[PDB]
Design a protein around this ligand. Structure first.
Ligand SMILES: [Ca+2]
Ligand SMILES: [Ca+2]
Length: 276
């Protein structure tokens, strides 16, 4: 039997599903450690690897990309879990190796691939503490091209009044996503700063794992795919909205939870964001 992870319900994705919107025809690039394309609860439509030592983007030695992918678009069926956008078109853009790490050069190549292949949404559940002009340039290029780019805010916790949001979440062109639990409480590891845009569930998030199994992880890495999936739901209902419109609706209709330094605009509400 199929289970719906709490986070899917917490962002009100089922309301869109009931309206008949599940992300159909929206192309979502999972820029991560690959996706186990053999998982029976995933449908991976394409992809590409930019890790020199791992030419196969459809094998995931880390599990990170496969878990992220399941939160975005685990299939609606008789097994496993259910994604935010279970009909979305998933693409495995491998820029991280089996250790779950990668160089910015690999990541940049993945974003370029997403642009060249006309992706609608980019999920980047990754980041580092140091900036990069080349990274900012390609991320801005993706946004100017019309792509919705969601990025994990970071797992560095809080440090007084200083921002701990990492890159590329720190860039204004990306949606920086923090993590809350099922009570809408901020996770203590969730990075904070003026760059934080929204929150999504990121504690004990059940999703798909390589080998056809399932398991729970914590991180802003897990919160980000809720926003990527939400953007895919919004585009399946409003195919003409620009990425700027999609972003504005996700942020402005969020459920305020408190100090924006720690919570941004609050918890995304895709039901309110997608209201005609
Ligand atoms: Ca399923
Ligand atoms: Ca992670």
């Amino acid at each position: 039997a199929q289970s719906v992870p709490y986070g899917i319900s917490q962002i009100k994705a089922p309301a869109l599903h009931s309206q008949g919107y599940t992300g159909s025809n929206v192309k979502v690039a999972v820029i991560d450690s690959g996706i186990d394309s053999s998982h029976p609860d995933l449908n991976v439509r394409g992809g590409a690897s930019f890790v020199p030592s791992e030419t196969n983007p459809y094998q995931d030695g880390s599990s990170h990309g496969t878990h992220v992918a399941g939160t975005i678009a685990a299939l609606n069926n008789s097994i496993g879990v259910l994604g935010v956008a279970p009909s979305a078109s998933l693409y495995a853009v491998k820029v991280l190796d089996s250790t779950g790490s990668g160089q910015y050069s690999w990541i940049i190549n993945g974003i370029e691939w997403a642009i060249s292949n006309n992706m609608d949404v980019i999920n980047m559940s990754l980041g580092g503490p140091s900036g990069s002009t080349a990274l900012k340039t390609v991320v801005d290029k993706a946004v100017s091209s019309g792509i919705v780019v969601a990025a994990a805010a970071g797992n560095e916790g809080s440090s007084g009044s200083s921002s701990t949001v990492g890159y590329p979440a720190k860039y204004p062109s990306t949606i920086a996503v923090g993590a809350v639990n099922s009570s809408n409480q901020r996770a203590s590891f969730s990075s904070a700063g003026s760059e934080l845009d929204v929150m999504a569930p990121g504690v004990s998030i059940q999703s798909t794992l390589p080998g056809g199994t399932y398991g729970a992880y914590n991180g802003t890495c897990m919160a980000t795919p809720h926003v990527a999936g939400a953007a895919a739901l919004i585009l399946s209902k409003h195919p003409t909205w620009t990425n700027a419109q999609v972003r504005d609706r996700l942020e402005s209709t969020a459920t305020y939870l408190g100090n924006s330094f720690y919570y941004g605009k609050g918890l995304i509400n895709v039901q309110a964001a997608a209201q005609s």
